[PDB]
Motif scaffolding. Structure first.
Motif, PDB file in Angstrom:
ATOM      1  N   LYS A   1       0.812  -1.210   0.000  1.00 36.58           N
ATOM      2  CA  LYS A   1       0.000   0.000   0.000  1.00 36.58           C
ATOM      3  C   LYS A   1       0.841   1.253   0.000  1.00 36.58           C
ATOM      4  O   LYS A   1       0.450   2.267   0.601  1.00 36.58           O
ATOM      5  CB  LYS A   1      -0.985   0.032   1.149  1.00 36.58           C
ATOM      6  N   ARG A   2       1.990   1.200  -0.619  1.00 33.22           N
ATOM      7  CA  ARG A   2       2.841   2.361  -0.839  1.00 33.22           C
ATOM      8  C   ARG A   2       2.979   2.650  -2.326  1.00 33.22           C
ATOM      9  O   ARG A   2       2.872   1.759  -3.159  1.00 33.22           O
ATOM     10  CB  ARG A   2       4.184   2.151  -0.251  1.00 33.22           C
ATOM     11  N   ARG A   3       3.231   3.910  -2.619  1.00 33.00           N
ATOM     12  CA  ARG A   3       3.406   4.359  -3.986  1.00 33.00           C
ATOM     13  C   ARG A   3       4.758   3.935  -4.535  1.00 33.00           C
ATOM     14  O   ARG A   3       5.804   4.180  -3.934  1.00 33.00           O
ATOM     15  CB  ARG A   3       3.275   5.877  -4.106  1.00 33.00           C
ATOM     16  N   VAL A   4       4.749   3.327  -5.697  1.00 33.81           N
ATOM     17  CA  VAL A   4       5.946   2.940  -6.435  1.00 33.81           C
ATOM     18  C   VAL A   4       6.202   3.836  -7.626  1.00 33.81           C
ATOM     19  O   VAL A   4       7.281   3.764  -8.232  1.00 33.81           O
ATOM     20  CB  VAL A   4       5.913   1.448  -6.876  1.00 33.81           C
ATOM     21  N   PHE A   5       5.211   4.653  -8.009  1.00 33.79           N
ATOM     22  CA  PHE A   5       5.296   5.467  -9.212  1.00 33.79           C
ATOM     23  C   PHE A   5       4.431   6.698  -9.007  1.00 33.79           C
ATOM     24  O   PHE A   5       3.311   6.583  -8.520  1.00 33.79           O
ATOM     25  CB  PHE A   5       4.804   4.680 -10.456  1.00 33.79           C
ATOM     26  N   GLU A   6       4.949   7.853  -9.431  1.00 36.95           N
ATOM     27  CA  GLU A   6       4.180   9.075  -9.509  1.00 36.95           C
ATOM     28  C   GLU A   6       4.698   9.880 -10.669  1.00 36.95           C
ATOM     29  O   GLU A   6       5.892  10.062 -10.760  1.00 36.95           O
ATOM     30  CB  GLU A   6       4.294   9.948  -8.252  1.00 36.95           C
ATOM     31  N   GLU A   7       3.804  10.435 -11.496  1.00 37.50           N
ATOM     32  CA  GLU A   7       4.221  11.380 -12.533  1.00 37.50           C
ATOM     33  C   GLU A   7       3.101  12.362 -12.756  1.00 37.50           C
ATOM     34  O   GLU A   7       1.943  11.931 -12.913  1.00 37.50           O
ATOM     35  CB  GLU A   7       4.545  10.661 -13.841  1.00 37.50           C
ATOM     36  N   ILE A   8       3.449  13.630 -12.843  1.00 31.19           N
ATOM     37  CA  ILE A   8       2.491  14.620 -13.331  1.00 31.19           C
ATOM     38  C   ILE A   8       2.362  14.479 -14.842  1.00 31.19           C
ATOM     39  O   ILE A   8       3.283  14.814 -15.608  1.00 31.19           O
ATOM     40  CB  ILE A   8       2.843  16.036 -12.896  1.00 31.19           C
TER      41      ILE A   8
END
Ligand code: CL
Ligand code: CO
Length: 88
Positions: A76-83
């Motif tokens: 339940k953690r973020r592995v990817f983020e992109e605007i």
């Protein structure tokens, strides 16, 4: 128009690796304070269905910011983020 990235490659990689896709959005006021607003969690595992959903979303949020998120379902953690979209 809007400023976007070439986010299909990341959608495909997240689906192929088994990460959960979700998105969040912000207007200029909320972007300025990093107070993103919750968007959808996309349940499809079909790349075409996810990409169609994201295209509608980006059209609704033209003039706003949209961030694509990948999450590890187990941790339940973020592995990817992109605007993926900014105001043009
Ligand atoms: Cl979907
Ligand atoms: Co990228």
């Amino acid at each position: 128009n809007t400023m976007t990235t070439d986010y299909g490659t990341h959608v495909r990689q997240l689906l192929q690796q088994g990460y959960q896709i979700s998105l969040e959005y912000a207007d200029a006021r909320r972007y300025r304070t990093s107070s993103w607003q919750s968007g959808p969690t996309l349940t499809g595992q079909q790349e075409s269905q996810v990409m169609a959903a994201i295209a509608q979303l980006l059209k609704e949020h033209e003039g706003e910011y949209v961030r694509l998120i990948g999450v590890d379902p187990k941790a339940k953690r973020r592995v990817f983020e992109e605007i993926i979209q900014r105001p043009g």
